[PDB]
Specification:
Elements lengths: L1 E5 L2 H12 L7 H23 L12 E6 L4 E6 L6 H9 L6 H8 L22 E9 L6 E5 L4 E6 L8 E8 L9 H11 L7 E3 L5
Parallel strand pairs: 2-8
Antiparallel strand pairs: 1-6, 2-3, 3-7, 4-5, 4-7, 5-6
Bound molecules: N-ethyl-5'-carboxamido adenosine.
N-ethyl-5'-carboxamido adenosine binds next to helix 2 and helix 3.
PDB class: chaperone/inhibitor
Keywords: Chaperone, Inhibitor, Chaperone-Inhibitor complex
Assembly: monomeric
Length: 210
Amino acid sequence: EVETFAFQAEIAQLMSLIINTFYSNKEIFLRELISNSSDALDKIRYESLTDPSKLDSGKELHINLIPNKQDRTLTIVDTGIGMTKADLINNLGTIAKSGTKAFMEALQAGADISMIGQFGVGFYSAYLVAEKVTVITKHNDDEQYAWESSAGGSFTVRTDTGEPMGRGTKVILHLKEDQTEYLEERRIKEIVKKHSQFIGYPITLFVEKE
Ligand SMILES: CCNC(=O)[C@H]1O[C@@H](n2cnc3c(N)ncnc32)[C@H](O)[C@@H]1O
């Protein structure tokens, strides 16, 4: 039921640099994931202009931030375009249209990790704070899939049943033990205000029930 894949070599190298470089300004991961969500929302907004039935899977365009202290997870949910199975494997597993090469060269020429979004690889900044990342996604043209990786050079993809989402993507960050500050309401609010205050879709920060 589960397929296991190797990252393209350059992607594994990039992930290793992100995981092993001493770099304290880890909060920038959230900006990068929210920007990726905003881009995905732009895409379905545009496609629905000439094909309104693409919103049959949900008209609302928004971003949800869901902390769970019991599971030690932070989840970033959007109702954007979503990804097909091929999209997951290509976009997360290979260089594809990213600036992976430019970023790694830039780091050797005076750039720092906070500039990762300039190079189209902001998603991998999740590994600044997460030991494992799970991506659940549903595109209008495919079934629901789950991508997962704890780095180390490989990732898995499986069909995801139970809790079907209408359309969009959930990025589930299983946080490192010493990065639980990013589950705290005050900290998340601070980061969103600092780095994501002009995003063109509603960002809702969920409250914990306990
Ligand atoms: C890992 C670096 N590559 C990407 O992030 C690409 O993966 C896709 N992607 C990333 N996040 C999302 C998302 N929330 N929704 C849809 N596609 C995404 C986009 O095509 C990105 O350009």
